[PDB]
Ligand binder design. Sequence first.
Ligand SMILES: *[Se]c1ccccc1C(=O)Nc1ccccn1
Ligand SMILES: *[Se]c1ccccc1C(=O)Nc1ccccn1
Ligand SMILES: [Cl-]
Ligand SMILES: [Cl-]
Ligand SMILES: [Zn+2]
Ligand SMILES: [Zn+2]
Ligand SMILES: [Zn+2]
Ligand SMILES: [Zn+2]
Lengths: 153, 153
Amino acid sequence: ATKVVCVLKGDGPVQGIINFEQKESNGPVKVWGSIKGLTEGLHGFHVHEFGDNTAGCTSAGPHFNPLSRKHGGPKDEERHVGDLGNVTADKDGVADVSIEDSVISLSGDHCIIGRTLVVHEKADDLGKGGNEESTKTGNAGSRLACGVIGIAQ
Amino acid sequence: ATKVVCVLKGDGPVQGIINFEQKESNGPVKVWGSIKGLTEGLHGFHVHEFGDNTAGCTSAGPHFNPLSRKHGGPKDEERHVGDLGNVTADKDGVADVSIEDSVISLSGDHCIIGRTLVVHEKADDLGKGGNEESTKTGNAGSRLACGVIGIAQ
Ligand SMILES: *[Se]c1ccccc1C(=O)Nc1ccccn1
Ligand SMILES: *[Se]c1ccccc1C(=O)Nc1ccccn1
Ligand SMILES: [Cl-]
Ligand SMILES: [Cl-]
Ligand SMILES: [Zn+2]
Ligand SMILES: [Zn+2]
Ligand SMILES: [Zn+2]
Ligand SMILES: [Zn+2]
């Protein structure tokens, strides 16, 4: 079982640790951990293309999209590979994260190792906003914190 | 072909950006960039096993060592895959880094993508210091800055 980990840091107080674990190729990835310092409610949660922090979270580039599709929710067929939807921050600003996804992988051309996990300013509208931005970024706004996705023990 | 990047950060003044590029699947990797905030002289420069920054640079684990060998300089047959030797900081505290290595890879068994680049406090003794520390860490001492090695544009 491939085990990977991401430490989210940014300019502000948003920080967290997210774990990923995949039992087989093309099988589901379990994604779990916590993020603190968030405003209460929905925050867009995406794998972006580049493991490049040279200019903070900006250098991570767009949502990881090797199939060249439009933005969606994780349950949509039409989605970016990086589209993990929303995490929910409780009133204390802590998001417990627990997601299962079969589109991201820890091997092959959909592999997210060496790419960047980003937690966003606002809710992802899951491609249902009816503007161009909806079908690119989900209108989730600015990058609060990010980390390069690395191999764990 | 494959281009990757690492942003080195820590709890002190050491900061840098290191690029890796590999033209052919199994050929040499070009390593270049710059690190600032260092003491003048030699600093150990290693790929460590885990792309895990949960507890700062300490969580990166030992030198990346898939062939279970003892520590050496990059030109030793007996070396860790992660053994890239030393970088040299000038009087200004800046190491201009430029290395070519054919034991690290950006593909396959010796691939360093999603692992951690660390720059150390002291010189790597290349395993010739005459103690246990020498043949594991090269006595390069404390981890000043590290980053997960990520996919670049
Ligand atoms: Se999983 C990962 C992360 C970064 C770069 C390459 C890979 C990878 O596993 N790719 C790959 C190529 C061919 C067959 C299987 N995996
Ligand atoms: Se390059 C890398 C980094 C992390 C995990 C896997 C890989 C990778 O590329 N593996 C691989 C599999 C098959 C053929 C070539 N590379
Ligand atoms: Cl949970
Ligand atoms: Cl050497
Ligand atoms: Zn995003
Ligand atoms: Zn998307
Ligand atoms: Zn080291
Ligand atoms: Zn070593």
